[PDB]
mmCIF file of N, CA and C and ligand atoms in Angstrom:
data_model
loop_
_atom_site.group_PDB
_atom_site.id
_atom_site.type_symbol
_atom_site.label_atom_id
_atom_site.label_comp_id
_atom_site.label_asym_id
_atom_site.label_seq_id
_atom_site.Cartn_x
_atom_site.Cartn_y
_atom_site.Cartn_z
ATOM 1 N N UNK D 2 74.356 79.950 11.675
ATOM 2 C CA UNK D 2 73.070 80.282 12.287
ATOM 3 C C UNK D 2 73.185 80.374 13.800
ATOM 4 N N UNK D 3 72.436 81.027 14.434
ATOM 5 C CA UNK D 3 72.392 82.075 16.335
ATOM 6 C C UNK D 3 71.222 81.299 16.311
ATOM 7 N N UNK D 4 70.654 80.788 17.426
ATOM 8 C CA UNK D 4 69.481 80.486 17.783
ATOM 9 C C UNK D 4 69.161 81.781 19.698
ATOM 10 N N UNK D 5 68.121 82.158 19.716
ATOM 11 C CA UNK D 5 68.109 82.741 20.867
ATOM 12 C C UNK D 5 66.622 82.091 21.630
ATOM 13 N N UNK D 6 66.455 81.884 22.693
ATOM 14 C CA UNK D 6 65.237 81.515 23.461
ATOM 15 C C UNK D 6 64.930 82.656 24.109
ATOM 16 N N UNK D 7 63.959 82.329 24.366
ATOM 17 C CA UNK D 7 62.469 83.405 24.934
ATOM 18 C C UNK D 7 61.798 82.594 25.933
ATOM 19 N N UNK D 8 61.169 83.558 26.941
ATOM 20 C CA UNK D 8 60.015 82.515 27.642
ATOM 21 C C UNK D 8 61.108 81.520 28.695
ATOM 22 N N UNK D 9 60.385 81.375 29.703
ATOM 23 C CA UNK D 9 60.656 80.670 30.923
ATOM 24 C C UNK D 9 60.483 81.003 32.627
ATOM 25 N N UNK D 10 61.308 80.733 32.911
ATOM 26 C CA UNK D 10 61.291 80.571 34.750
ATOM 27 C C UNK D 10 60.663 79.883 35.029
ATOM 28 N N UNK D 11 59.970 80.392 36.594
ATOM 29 C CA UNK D 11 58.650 79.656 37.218
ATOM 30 C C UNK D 11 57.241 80.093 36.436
ATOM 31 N N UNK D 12 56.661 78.916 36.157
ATOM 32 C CA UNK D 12 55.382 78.582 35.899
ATOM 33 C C UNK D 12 54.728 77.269 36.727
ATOM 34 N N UNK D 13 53.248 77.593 36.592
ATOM 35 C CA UNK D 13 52.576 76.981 37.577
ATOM 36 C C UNK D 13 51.850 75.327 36.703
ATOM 37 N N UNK D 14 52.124 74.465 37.646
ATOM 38 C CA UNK D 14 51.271 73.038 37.011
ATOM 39 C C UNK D 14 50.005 73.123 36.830
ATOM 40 N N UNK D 15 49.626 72.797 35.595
ATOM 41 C CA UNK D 15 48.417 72.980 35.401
ATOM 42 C C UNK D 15 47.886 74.188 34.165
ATOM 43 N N UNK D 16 49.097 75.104 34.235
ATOM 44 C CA UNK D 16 48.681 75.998 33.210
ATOM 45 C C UNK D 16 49.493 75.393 31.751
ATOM 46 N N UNK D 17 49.646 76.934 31.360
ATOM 47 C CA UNK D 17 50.592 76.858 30.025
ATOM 48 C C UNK D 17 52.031 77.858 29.744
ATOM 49 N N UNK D 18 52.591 77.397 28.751
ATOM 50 C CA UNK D 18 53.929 78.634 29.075
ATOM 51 C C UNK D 18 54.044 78.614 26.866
ATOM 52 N N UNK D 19 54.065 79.276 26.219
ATOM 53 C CA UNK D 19 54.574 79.736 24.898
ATOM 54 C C UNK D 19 56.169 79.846 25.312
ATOM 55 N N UNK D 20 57.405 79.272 25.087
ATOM 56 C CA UNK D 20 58.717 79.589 24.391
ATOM 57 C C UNK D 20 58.684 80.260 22.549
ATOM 58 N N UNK D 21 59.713 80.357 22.626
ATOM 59 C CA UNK D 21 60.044 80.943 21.222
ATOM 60 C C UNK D 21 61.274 81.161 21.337
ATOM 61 N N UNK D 22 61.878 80.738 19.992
ATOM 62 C CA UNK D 22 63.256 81.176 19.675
ATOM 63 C C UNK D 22 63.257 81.760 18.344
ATOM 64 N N UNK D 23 64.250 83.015 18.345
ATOM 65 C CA UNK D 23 64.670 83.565 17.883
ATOM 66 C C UNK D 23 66.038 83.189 16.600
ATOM 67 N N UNK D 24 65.781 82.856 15.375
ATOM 68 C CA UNK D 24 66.850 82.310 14.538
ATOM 69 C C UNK D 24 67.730 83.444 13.176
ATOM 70 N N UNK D 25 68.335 83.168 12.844
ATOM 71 C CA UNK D 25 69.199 83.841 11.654
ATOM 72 C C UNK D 25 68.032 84.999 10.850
ATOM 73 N N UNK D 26 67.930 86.056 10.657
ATOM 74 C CA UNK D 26 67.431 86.527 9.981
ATOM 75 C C UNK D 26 68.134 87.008 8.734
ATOM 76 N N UNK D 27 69.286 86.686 8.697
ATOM 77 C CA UNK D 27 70.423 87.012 7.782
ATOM 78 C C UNK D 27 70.343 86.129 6.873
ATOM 79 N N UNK D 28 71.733 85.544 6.238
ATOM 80 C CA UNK D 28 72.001 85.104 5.027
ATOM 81 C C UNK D 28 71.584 83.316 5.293
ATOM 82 N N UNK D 29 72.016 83.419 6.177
ATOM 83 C CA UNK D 29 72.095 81.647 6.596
ATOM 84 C C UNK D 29 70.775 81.342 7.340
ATOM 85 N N UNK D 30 70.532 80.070 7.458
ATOM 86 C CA UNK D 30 68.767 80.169 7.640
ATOM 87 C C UNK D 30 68.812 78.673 8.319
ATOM 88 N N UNK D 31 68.440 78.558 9.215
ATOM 89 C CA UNK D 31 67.770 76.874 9.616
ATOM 90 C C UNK D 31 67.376 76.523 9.157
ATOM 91 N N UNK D 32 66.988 75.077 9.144
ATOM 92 C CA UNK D 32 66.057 73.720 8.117
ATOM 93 C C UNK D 32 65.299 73.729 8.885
ATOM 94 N N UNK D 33 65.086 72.227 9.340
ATOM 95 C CA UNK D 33 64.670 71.636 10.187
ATOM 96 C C UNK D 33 64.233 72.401 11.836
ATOM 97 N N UNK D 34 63.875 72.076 12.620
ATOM 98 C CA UNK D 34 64.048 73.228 13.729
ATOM 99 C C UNK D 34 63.223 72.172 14.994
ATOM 100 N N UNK D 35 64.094 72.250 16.563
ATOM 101 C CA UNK D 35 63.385 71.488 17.376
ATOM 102 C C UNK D 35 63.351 72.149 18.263
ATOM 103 N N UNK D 36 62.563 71.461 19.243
ATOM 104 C CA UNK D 36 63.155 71.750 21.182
ATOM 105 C C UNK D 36 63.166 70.616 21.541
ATOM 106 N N UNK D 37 65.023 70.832 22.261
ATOM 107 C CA UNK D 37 64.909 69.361 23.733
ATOM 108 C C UNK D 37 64.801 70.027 24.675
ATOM 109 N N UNK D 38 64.886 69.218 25.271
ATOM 110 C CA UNK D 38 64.971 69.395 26.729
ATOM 111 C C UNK D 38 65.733 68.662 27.655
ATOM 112 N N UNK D 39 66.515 69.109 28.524
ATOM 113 C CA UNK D 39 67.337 68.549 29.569
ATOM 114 C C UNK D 39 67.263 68.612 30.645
ATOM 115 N N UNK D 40 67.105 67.521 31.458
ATOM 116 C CA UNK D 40 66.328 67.395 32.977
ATOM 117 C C UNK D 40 68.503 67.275 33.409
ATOM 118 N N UNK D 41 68.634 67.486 34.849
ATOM 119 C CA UNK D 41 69.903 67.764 35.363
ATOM 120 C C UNK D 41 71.071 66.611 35.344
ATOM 121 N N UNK D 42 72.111 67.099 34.961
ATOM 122 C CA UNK D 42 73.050 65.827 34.585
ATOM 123 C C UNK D 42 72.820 64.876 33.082
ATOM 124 N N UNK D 43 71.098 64.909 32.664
ATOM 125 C CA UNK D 43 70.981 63.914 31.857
ATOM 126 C C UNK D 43 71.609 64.899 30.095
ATOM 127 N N UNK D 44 70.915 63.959 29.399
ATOM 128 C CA UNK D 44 71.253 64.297 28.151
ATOM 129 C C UNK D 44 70.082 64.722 27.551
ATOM 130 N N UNK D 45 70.725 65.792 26.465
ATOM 131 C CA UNK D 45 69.352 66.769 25.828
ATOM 132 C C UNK D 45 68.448 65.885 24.839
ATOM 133 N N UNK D 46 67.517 65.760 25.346
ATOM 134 C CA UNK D 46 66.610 64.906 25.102
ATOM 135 C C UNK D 46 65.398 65.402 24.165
ATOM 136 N N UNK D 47 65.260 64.717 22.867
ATOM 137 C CA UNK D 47 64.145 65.441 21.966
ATOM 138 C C UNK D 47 62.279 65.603 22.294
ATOM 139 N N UNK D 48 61.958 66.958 22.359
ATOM 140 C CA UNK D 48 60.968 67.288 22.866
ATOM 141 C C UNK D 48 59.596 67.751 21.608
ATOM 142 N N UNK D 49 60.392 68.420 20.881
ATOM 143 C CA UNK D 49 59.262 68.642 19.581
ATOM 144 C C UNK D 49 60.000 68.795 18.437
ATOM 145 N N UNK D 50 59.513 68.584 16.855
ATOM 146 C CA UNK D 50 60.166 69.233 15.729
ATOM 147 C C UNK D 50 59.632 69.378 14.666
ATOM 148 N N UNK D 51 60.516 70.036 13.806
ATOM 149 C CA UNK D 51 59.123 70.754 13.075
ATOM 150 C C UNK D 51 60.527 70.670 11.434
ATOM 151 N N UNK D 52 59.470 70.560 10.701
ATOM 152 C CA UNK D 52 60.369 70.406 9.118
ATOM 153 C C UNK D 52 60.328 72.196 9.105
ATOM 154 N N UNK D 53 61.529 72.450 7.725
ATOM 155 C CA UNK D 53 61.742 73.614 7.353
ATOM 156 C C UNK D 53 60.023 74.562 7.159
ATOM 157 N N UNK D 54 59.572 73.512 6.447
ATOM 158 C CA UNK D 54 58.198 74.452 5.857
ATOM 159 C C UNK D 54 57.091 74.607 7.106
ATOM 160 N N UNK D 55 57.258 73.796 8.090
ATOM 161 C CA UNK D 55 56.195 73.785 9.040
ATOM 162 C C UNK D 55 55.269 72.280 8.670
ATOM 163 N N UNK D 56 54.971 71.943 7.688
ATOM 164 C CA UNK D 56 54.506 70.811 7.191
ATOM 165 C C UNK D 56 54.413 69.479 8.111
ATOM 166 N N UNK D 57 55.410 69.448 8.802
ATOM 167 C CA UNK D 57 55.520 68.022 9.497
ATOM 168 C C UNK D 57 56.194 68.717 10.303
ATOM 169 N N UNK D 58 55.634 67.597 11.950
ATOM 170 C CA UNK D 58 55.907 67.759 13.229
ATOM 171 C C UNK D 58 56.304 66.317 13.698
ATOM 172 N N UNK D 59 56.767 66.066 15.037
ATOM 173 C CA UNK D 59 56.539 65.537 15.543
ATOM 174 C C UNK D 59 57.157 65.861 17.320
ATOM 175 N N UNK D 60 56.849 64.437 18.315
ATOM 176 C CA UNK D 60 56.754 65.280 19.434
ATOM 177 C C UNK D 60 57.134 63.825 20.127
ATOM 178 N N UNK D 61 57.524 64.199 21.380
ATOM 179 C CA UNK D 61 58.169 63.030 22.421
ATOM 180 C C UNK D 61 57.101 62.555 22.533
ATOM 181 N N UNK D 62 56.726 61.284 23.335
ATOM 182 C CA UNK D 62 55.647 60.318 23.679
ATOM 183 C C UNK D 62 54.588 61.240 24.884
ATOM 184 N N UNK D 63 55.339 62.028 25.521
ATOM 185 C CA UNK D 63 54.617 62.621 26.885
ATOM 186 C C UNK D 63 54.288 63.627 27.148
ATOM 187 N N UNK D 64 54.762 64.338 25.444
ATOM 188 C CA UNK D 64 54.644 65.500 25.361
ATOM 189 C C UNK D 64 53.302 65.714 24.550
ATOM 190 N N UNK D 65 53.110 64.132 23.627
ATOM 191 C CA UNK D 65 52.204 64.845 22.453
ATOM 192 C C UNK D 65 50.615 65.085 22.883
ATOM 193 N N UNK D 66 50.040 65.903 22.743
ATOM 194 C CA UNK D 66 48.668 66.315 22.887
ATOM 195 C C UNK D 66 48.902 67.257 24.099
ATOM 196 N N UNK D 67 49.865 67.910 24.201
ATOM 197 C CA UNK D 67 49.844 69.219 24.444
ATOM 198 C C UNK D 67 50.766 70.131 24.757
ATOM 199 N N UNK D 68 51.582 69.869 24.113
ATOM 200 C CA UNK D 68 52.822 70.560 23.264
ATOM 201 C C UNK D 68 52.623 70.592 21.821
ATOM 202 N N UNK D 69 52.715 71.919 21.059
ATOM 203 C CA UNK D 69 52.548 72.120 19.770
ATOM 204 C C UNK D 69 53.879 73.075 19.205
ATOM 205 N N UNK D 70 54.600 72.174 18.345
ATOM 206 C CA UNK D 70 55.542 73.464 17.615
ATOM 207 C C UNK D 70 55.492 73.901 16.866
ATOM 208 N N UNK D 71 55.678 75.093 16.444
ATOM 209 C CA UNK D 71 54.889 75.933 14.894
ATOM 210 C C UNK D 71 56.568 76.608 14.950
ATOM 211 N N UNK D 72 56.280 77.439 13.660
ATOM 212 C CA UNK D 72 57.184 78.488 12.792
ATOM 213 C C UNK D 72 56.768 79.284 12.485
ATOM 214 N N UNK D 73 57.079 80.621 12.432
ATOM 215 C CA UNK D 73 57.207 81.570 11.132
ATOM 216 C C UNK D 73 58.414 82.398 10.466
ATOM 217 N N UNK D 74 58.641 81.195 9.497
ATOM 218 C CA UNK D 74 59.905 81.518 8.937
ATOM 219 C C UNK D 74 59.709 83.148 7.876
ATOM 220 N N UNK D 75 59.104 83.833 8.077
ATOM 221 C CA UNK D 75 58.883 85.531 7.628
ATOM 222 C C UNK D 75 59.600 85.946 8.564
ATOM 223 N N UNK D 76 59.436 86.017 9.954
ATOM 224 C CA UNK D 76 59.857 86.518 11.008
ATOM 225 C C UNK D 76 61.038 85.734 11.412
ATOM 226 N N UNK D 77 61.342 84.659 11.074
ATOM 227 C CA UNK D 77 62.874 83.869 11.488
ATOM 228 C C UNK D 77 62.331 84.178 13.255
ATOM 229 N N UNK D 78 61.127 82.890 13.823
ATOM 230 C CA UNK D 78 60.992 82.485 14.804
ATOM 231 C C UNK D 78 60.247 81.299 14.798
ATOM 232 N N UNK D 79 60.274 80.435 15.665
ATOM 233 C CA UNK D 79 59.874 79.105 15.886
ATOM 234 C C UNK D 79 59.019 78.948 17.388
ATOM 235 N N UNK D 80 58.346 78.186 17.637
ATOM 236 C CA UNK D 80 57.649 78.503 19.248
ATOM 237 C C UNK D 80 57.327 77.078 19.446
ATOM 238 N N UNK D 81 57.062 77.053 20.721
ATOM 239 C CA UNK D 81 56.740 75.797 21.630
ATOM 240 C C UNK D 81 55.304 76.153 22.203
ATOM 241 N N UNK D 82 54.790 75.801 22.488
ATOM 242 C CA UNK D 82 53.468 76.084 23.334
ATOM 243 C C UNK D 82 52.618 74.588 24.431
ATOM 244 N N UNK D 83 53.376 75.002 25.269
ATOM 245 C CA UNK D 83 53.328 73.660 26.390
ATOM 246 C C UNK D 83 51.998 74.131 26.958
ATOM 247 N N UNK D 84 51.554 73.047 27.732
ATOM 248 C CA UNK D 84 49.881 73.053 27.767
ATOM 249 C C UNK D 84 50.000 72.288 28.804
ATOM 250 N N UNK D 85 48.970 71.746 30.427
ATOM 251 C CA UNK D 85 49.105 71.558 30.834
ATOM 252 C C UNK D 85 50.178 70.871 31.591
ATOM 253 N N UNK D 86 50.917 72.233 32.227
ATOM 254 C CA UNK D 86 52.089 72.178 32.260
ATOM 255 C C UNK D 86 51.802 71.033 33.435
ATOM 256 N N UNK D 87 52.971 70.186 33.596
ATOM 257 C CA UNK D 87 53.389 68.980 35.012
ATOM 258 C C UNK D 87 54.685 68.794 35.508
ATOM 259 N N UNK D 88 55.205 68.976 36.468
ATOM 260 C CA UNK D 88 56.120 68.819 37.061
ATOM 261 C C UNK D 88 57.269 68.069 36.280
ATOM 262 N N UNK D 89 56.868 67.059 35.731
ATOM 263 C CA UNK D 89 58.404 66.473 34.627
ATOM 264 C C UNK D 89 58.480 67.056 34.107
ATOM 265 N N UNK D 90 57.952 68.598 33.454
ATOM 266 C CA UNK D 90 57.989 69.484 32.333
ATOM 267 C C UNK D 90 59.026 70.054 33.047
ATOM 268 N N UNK D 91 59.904 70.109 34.323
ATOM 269 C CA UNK D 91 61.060 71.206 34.675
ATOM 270 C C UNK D 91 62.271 70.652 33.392
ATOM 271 N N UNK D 92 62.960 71.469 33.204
ATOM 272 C CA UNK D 92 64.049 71.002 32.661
ATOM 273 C C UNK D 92 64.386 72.317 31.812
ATOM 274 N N UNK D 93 65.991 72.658 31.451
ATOM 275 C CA UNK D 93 66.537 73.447 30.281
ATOM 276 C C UNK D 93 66.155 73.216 29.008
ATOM 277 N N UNK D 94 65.212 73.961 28.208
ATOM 278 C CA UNK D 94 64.569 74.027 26.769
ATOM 279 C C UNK D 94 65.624 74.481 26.272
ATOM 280 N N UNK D 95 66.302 73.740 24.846
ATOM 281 C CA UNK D 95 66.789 74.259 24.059
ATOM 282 C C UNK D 95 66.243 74.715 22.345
ATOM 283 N N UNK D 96 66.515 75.788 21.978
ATOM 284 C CA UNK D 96 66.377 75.351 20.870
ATOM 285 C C UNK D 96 67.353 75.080 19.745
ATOM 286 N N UNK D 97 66.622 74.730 18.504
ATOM 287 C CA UNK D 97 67.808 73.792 17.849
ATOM 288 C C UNK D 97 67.851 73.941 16.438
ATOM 289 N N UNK D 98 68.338 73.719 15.659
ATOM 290 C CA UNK D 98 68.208 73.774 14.016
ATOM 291 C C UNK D 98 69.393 72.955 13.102
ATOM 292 N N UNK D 99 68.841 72.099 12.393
ATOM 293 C CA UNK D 99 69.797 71.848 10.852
ATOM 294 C C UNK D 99 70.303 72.995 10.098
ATOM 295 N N UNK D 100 70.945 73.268 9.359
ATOM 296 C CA UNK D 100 71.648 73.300 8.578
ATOM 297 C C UNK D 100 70.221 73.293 7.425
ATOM 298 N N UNK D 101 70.412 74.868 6.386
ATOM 299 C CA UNK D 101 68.954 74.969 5.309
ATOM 300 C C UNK D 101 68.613 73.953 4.432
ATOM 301 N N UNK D 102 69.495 73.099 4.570
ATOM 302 C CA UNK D 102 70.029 72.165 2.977
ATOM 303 C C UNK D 102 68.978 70.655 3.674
ATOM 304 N N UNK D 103 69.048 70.734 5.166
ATOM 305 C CA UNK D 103 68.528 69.576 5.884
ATOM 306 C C UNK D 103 67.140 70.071 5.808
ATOM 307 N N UNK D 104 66.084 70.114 5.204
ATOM 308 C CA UNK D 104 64.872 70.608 5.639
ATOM 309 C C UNK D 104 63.911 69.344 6.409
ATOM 310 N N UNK D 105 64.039 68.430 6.879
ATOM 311 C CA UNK D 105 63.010 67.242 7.588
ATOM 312 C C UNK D 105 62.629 67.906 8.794
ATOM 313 N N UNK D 106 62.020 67.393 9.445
ATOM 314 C CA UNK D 106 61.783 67.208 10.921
ATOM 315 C C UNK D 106 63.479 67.128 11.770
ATOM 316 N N UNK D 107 63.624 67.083 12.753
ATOM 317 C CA UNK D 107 64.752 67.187 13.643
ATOM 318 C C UNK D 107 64.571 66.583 14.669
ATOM 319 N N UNK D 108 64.798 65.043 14.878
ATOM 320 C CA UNK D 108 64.427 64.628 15.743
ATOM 321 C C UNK D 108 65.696 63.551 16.639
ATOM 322 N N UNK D 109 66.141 64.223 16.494
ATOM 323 C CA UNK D 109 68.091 63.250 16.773
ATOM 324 C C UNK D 109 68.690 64.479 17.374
ATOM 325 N N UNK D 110 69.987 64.511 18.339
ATOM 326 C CA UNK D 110 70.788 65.609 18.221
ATOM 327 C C UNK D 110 72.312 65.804 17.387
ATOM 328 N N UNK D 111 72.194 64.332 16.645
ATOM 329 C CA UNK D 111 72.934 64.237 15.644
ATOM 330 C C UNK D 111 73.345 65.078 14.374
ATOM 331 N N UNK D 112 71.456 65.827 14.641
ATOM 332 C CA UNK D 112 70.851 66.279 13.273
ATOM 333 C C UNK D 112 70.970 67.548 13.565
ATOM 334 N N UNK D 113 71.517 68.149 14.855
ATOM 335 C CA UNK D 113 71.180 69.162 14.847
ATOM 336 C C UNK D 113 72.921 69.991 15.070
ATOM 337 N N UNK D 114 73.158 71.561 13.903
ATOM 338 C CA UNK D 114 74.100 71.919 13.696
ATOM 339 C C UNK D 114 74.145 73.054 14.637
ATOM 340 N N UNK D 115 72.798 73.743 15.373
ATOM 341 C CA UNK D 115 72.760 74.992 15.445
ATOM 342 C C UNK D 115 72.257 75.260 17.055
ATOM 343 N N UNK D 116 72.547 75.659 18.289
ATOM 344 C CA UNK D 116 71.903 75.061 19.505
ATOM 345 C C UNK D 116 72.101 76.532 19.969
ATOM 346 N N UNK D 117 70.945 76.839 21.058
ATOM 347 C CA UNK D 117 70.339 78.068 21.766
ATOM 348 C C UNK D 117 71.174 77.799 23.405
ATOM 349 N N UNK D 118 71.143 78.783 24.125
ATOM 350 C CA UNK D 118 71.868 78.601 25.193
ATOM 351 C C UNK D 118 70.680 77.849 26.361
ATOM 352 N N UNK D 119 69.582 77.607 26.167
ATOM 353 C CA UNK D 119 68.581 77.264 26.383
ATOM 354 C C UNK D 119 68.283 78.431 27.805
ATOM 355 N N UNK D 120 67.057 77.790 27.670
ATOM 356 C CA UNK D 120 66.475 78.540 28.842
ATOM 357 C C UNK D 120 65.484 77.678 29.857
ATOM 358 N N UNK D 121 65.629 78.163 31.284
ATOM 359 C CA UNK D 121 65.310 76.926 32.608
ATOM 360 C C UNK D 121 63.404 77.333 32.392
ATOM 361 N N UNK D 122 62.951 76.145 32.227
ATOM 362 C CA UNK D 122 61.375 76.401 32.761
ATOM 363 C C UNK D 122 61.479 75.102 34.060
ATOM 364 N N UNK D 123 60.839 75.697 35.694
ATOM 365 C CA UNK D 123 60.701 75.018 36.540
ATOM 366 C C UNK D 123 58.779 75.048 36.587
ATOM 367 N N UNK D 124 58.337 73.657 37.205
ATOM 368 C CA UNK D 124 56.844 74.034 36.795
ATOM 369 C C UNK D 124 56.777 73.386 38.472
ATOM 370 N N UNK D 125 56.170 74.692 39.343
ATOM 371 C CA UNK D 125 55.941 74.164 40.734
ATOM 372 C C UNK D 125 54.370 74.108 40.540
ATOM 373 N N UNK D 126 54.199 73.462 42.164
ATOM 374 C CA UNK D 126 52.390 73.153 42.947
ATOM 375 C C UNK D 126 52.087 74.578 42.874
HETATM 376 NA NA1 NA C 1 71.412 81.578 22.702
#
């Protein structure tokens, strides 16, 4: 499985920014499916995730109530939708995926087989 990202650069604090990644439309298919995120030097750090079916989510502590991750596995794409964006929101979004056989939530990077080259969102004044 290819994961590709969408969406980024500069965005402004206070608004919102939609990501989306782009996954396998072919034979092989993601499970599970997330976004981290990596602030500079640190480690990719889990930001949202979402089970194979869409069914179950979950979301970092600072993210939740306004960050939402959805799917539509018809289209083999997944999205982020950040919401009042804030300055700790800078960091490299990746996206991410199990392996089809893993269908849970994705909330480890243990769990995850399949990684996007990510893409930089900076959120200035
Ligand atoms: Na990529």
């Amino acid at each position: 499985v290819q994961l590709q990202e969408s969406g980024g650069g500069l965005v402004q604090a206070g608004g919102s920014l939609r990501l989306s990644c782009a996954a396998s439309g072919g034979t092989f298919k993601s499970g599970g499916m997330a976004w981290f995120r990596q602030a500079p030097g640190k480690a990719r750090e889990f930001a949202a995730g979402i089970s194979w079916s869409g069914g179950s989510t979950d979301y970092e502590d600072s993210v939740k109530g306004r960050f939402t991750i959805s799917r539509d596995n018809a289209k083999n794409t997944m999205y982020l939708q950040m919401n009042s964006l804030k300055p700790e929101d800078t960091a490299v979004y990746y996206c991410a995926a199990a392996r089809r056989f893993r269908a849970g939530v994705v909330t480890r990077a243990d769990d995850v087989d399949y990684w996007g080259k990510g893409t930089q969102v900076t959120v200035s004044s």
